[PDB]
A paper describes a structure:
The UbiD decarboxylases are prevalent in microbes and reversibly decarboxylate (hetero)aromatic and unsaturated aliphatic acid compounds using the highly modified prenylated flavin mononucleotide (prFMN) cofactor. Here, we characterize I3C decarboxylase from Arthrobacter nicotianae (AnInD). We provide structural and biochemical insights into AnInD, revealing the enzyme to be strictly specific for indole-3-carboxylic acid (I3C). Structural insights from crystal structure determination combined with small-angle X-ray scattering (SAXS) measurements reveal the enzyme undergoes an open-closed transition as a consequence of prFMN domain motion, an event likely coupled to catalysis.
Residue numbers in the entry:
A (entry chain C), B (entry chain E): 1 to 184, 187 to 454
Write the structure that this text describes.
């Protein structure tokens, strides 16, 4: 249950019968994403064997099911956030130095075609996206002053066969490395089709891996041995050796061009706007490369939840007794709604749980508290807790004029109202709140034919 | 797409591949319900071929999927509430008189064993239920003064081989017929394994079918020809001829015995308490009888929602422009949460929608309003509307000290607080609230191998 590269992942999923093979030709323009969309969240990913008759298949849906990600590393869905956090803790405490290797030993350096981005089966995802996007690509970039690596993930729109337009949010580390090159232009690699270890490194936030620190070793914790890197053709760039595809790239500051629209976590479109142009100097491919894309939605909600929930639980359970679990629900775009599950020990702690949760995760708009006997990850079950337990008069806590996330239109200019719901039963515990219960049953204990 | 009896239903489901056959022996005590519970809500019912080696199999889960009920009558899940209401309208306007038939022509009169309730595979459902229950049984009872029929559905607990304890809520028509016999004791039949038409007749509320009116003709609207009835052995009683099983029963007023606990719609237990004892005078069975039981949960939520939603929609759309649909959600126990979907035409109507909905359905605790582009029946999607569109400051409307449903512990003594959520986008419509969209795609148009 360790994985060197995406090949390992796909074979494991294929073997486990958690792969959906779409054998028919599909169009990279809208149709592919459309099919993905009908499967979003089920316990399998999707391999498109034939995209516009490309030799290169595309994989989508790797991140939309915690059960699937768990199966790849042998952990239950419920234990995955702790699993990942424990591994990031081990990296912080004893980092594994990368292994630099010779160009002709690096599987990704197998081929170097003349740069034609339109030869790649890059999907146009949502119906109003401003073009085809690579959105699963991990950017590795060296500090122009100190050579220290930074690993981030960023959406790149294809303009033409050799140009991308990239979105760099405010306070991103890639942003800061560009500021340094603009005191001299910034080279980097875009590594498409990486294993989850690289994905989690890329998505690890600033306060876990500061600017002056190399988060890529996080990936080493999810594979035997160290992360393999390789000198590019640049040579200011460093390439991920075990990537399916890797793009050597260069970008000048103060050189903007229209990119977007694209889907945001909110489920709304980004504004099309002038954002940095990046020019693709070279292309490297394994033999039998699969192109990896992410469908905006649960794939992103789970990326954020798996990395963020353990810290949040840690912060709330430290301030409040009897906390059991915290969910950054998919309904809330893995960012705007937290459900906190606790075992009450005294009246009043449920409200402290609301304060602690809102204080620990500034983007949150809603917090719901529920008891140990409610499934915090089932929105039906939280609705039920609201319907039978919430006191609308005393259990709704509203915070006005507070800081929040500006992408969410409930928070114009990073400013608005938050609300907590205390959907707990009354304490001390009373019979009138004791839930009915059906015997728990192993279905393998019986012969069951379900439809034919 | 018409059905004379339960046999018709089961064959149609079997043919349609919407039947789950559990072939292994299962225990009527807890185990059976436990298996049902793992399937609750999916697009199939469950036939248990072998319950404690009884010759009689049991059917469960007929009502937990509107898609399944729709498939039986050729209507989409979305059109089923209107379908049922239209048919009850036709019955109110032009009722079909019943067909009385000779004892030896009535399939249910095939056999009349010595009365042994413990020979029947009657499930003990929830782990703290006070015994085995028949809960899908339709009671037919004649007015002791006027002979006019009343059809209701009531939970009966088995005490011993010839005695049941029944729960009769306040203001039930069976209650009123008992008050009349107690001016002279009340006979009636308990008809188990009936088609949905009989179920909907039984569940049709007081204000649609008054005390002095015979609701059983409603069933005639869901079958070719009239409802077949037959003289019992009593002979103050009337039996449903096409039932799988029918129990001739007698009950004296002021003759109480401990019954319960049992699951209520809330998902909590009823208080065990002195409630009327009923004594089973005779038992009738088809050959090839199947015993029909209901799992407390979605089976009950859909019974209430399918009968109630059209009236509620009718009442709200009359007072407010742009109403499209109203859901009595399963999270709210088909009773405590209504989601109202509308197409906004002017600021302010969303709040009138909250007032109209609360006014039209007194049990409601929560109302949520959403726009045309949110799936009101998907709790994830309503959570999303809450996360991105609700203004917590101006969009939460709280009503205190109002009437509500006493079974819900948020409303002690039929008194408490209600709350409406206005999770609509801003009007006039703005780009920042336009949801991303993936192309709609027919999956039958492609070769897809899904796991193996
Ligand atoms: C998980 C994830 C994170 C995205 C992201 C996506 C995903 C799935 C996409 C691909 C679906 C859409 C695009 N994303 C962008 C993004 N940050 C950014 O500046 N621009 C982006 O366009 N991020 C966030 C960024 O990669 C993380 O916050 C890193 O932790 C930042 O790295 P750093 O701390 O080294 O700066
Ligand atoms: C759908 C449904 C309705 C139940 C019901 C259930 C279901 C599934 C069960 C079986 C799961 C639990 C028990 N139920 C009872 C009940 N009414 C009552 O007085 N006592 C009950 O125990 N009802 C409702 C009752 O039958 C309806 O209110 C009828 O409209 C009454 O007919 P009436 O208007 O002629 O009185
Ligand atoms: Mn960093
Ligand atoms: Mn009636
Ligand atoms: Na990072
Ligand atoms: Na009735």
């Amino acid at each position: 249950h360790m994985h060197k590269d995406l090949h390992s992942i796909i074979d494991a999923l294929d073997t486990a019968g958690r792969l959906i093979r779409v054998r028919s030709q599909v169009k990279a323009e809208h149709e592919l994403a459309g099919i993905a969309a009908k499967y979003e969240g089920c316990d399998k990913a999707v391999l498109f064997e034939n995209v516009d008759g490309n030799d290169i298949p595309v994989l989508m849906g790797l991140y939309w099911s915690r059960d699937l990600l768990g199966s790849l590393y042998g952990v239950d869905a419920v234990d995955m956030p702790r699993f990942i956090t424990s591994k990031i803790s081990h990296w912080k405490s004893e980092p594994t130095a990368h292994q630099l290797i010779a160009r002709e030993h690096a599987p990704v350096m197998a081929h170097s075609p003349r740069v034609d981005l339109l030869s790649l089966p890059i999907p146009v995802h949502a119906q109003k996206d401003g073009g085809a996007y690579v959105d699963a690509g991990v950017v590795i970039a060296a500090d122009p002053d100190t050579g220290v690596l930074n690993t981030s993930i960023q959406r790149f729109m294809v303009e033409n066969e050799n140009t991308l337009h990239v979105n760099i949010d405010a306070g991103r580390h890639l942003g800061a490395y560009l500021a340094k090159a603009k005191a001299k232009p910034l080279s980097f690699s875009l590594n498409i089709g990486v294993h989850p270890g690289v994905h989690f490194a890329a998505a690890t936030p600033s306060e876990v891996a500061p600017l002056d620190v190399d988060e890529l070793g996080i990936a080493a914790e999810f594979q035997d041995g160290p992360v393999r890197i390789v000198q590019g053709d640049d040579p200011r760039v460093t390439v991920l050796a075990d990537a399916m595809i890797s793009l050597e790239c260069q970008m000048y500051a103060d050189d903007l061009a229209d990119e977007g629209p694209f889907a945001e976590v909110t489920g709304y479109y980004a504004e099309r706007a002038p954002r940095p142009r990046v020019t693709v100097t070279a292309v490297h491919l394994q033999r039998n490369p699969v192109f990896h894309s992410i469908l905006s939605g649960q794939e992103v909600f789970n990326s954020v939840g798996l990395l963020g929930e353990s810290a949040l639980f840690d912060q709330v359970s430290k301030q409040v007794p009897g906390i059991l679990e915290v969910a950054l629900t998919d309904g809330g775009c893995g960012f705007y709604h937290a459900v906190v599950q606790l075992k009450q020990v005294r009246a009043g702690w449920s409200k402290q749980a609301i304060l602690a949760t809102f204080a620990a995760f500034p983007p949150l708009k809603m917090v719901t508290i529920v008891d140990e006997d409610v499934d915090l990850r089932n929105p039906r079950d939280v609705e039920w807790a609201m319907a039978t337990r919430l006191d609308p008069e005393r259990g709704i806590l509203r915070i006005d004029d507070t800081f929040g996330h500006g992408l969410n239109p409930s928070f114009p200019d990073y400013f608005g109202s938050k609300v907590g719901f205390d959907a707990t039963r009354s304490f001390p515990f009373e019979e009138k709140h004791e839930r009915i219960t059906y015997q728990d049953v192993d279905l393998s204990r019986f012969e069951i034919v379900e439809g034919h």
